[PDB]
Amino acid sequence: ELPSLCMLNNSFYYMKGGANIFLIRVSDVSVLMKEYDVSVYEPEDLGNCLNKSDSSWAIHWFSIALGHDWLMDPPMLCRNKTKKEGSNIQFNISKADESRVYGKKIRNGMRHLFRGFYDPCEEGKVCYVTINQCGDPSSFEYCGTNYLSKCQF
Ligand SMILES: *[C@@H]1O[C@H](CO)[C@@H](O[C@@H]2O[C@H](CO)[C@@H](O)[C@H](O)[C@H]2NC(C)=O)[C@H](O)[C@H]1NC(C)=O
Ligand SMILES: *[C@@H]1O[C@H](CO)[C@@H](O)[C@H](O)[C@H]1NC(C)=O
Ligand SMILES: *[C@@H]1O[C@H](CO)[C@@H](O)[C@H](O)[C@H]1NC(C)=O
Ligand SMILES: *[C@@H]1O[C@H](CO)[C@@H](O)[C@H](O)[C@H]1NC(C)=O
Numbered sequence: 001e002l003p004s005l006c007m008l009n010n011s012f013y014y015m016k017g018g019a020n021i022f023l024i025r026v027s028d029v030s031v032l033m034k035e036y037d038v039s040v041y042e043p044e045d046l047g048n049c050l051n052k053s054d055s056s057w058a059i060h061w062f063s064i065a066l067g068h069d070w071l072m073d074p075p076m077l078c079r080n081k082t083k084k085e086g087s088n089i090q091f092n093i094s095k096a097d098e099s100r101v102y103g104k105k106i107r108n109g110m111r112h113l114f115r116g117f118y119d120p121c122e123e124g125k126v127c128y129v130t131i132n133q134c135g136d137p138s139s140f141e142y143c144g145t146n147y148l149s150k151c152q153f
Helices: 043-048 053-066 100-113
Strands: 004-007 012-017 020-027 038-040 076-078 089-092 128-133
Touching: 012 053, 020 053, 038 043, 043 053, 053 089, 053 100, 053 128, 089 100
Parallel strands: none
Antiparallel strands: 004 012, 012 020, 020 128, 038 076, 076 089, 089 128
């Protein structure tokens, strides 16, 4: 009934929600841009981030699990599903004054979902949690069997 979660290492994680699998990475680089890419204001805006209808519930579940407040928190950014390059849904957790409180909350959520998670975000620098759906070109090689066989799925 809940999505299944896997931790590969401190930067690479996976979620399985029904038939869909998602690559979740913690990193210090983003190629998304507010007012160019899509701002995810409400849960149903996730439909503009993902080509599969049955994927939105799982991403929403994960957002709630991390502590995202849909009404009040900074909107997630995502790449529009009309782009062939593939899904890229992003939480900005930077240790910088504008996103500081939010990032702390989201890292606490990561810690609660993956007890082995340690904080890799540097003070005054950018830091992100980024999700790509397996099977989109934006997942590159990382949903191959040589990766996923390390997860329980
Ligand atoms: C993620 O959040 C960080 C922190 O708010 C953003 O970086 C800041 O952007 C503002 C607005 O342009 C700058 O004035 C600050 O100097 C930046 N701070 C740092 C530490 O870089 C960053 O742009 C956000 N990322 C995305 C993709 O929107
Ligand atoms: C986790 O594994 C990926 C894929 O092999 C690798 O690229 C990445 O650097 C690893 N992360 C850490 C923190 O070792
Ligand atoms: C996504 O891109 C299409 C064009 O490719 C555009 O018509 C649509 O408004 C975009 N959606 C969002 C939410 O920006
Ligand atoms: C999503 O589907 C639309 C329409 O079929 C297409 O333009 C786009 O390339 C697809 N995106 C991905 C990431 O598969």
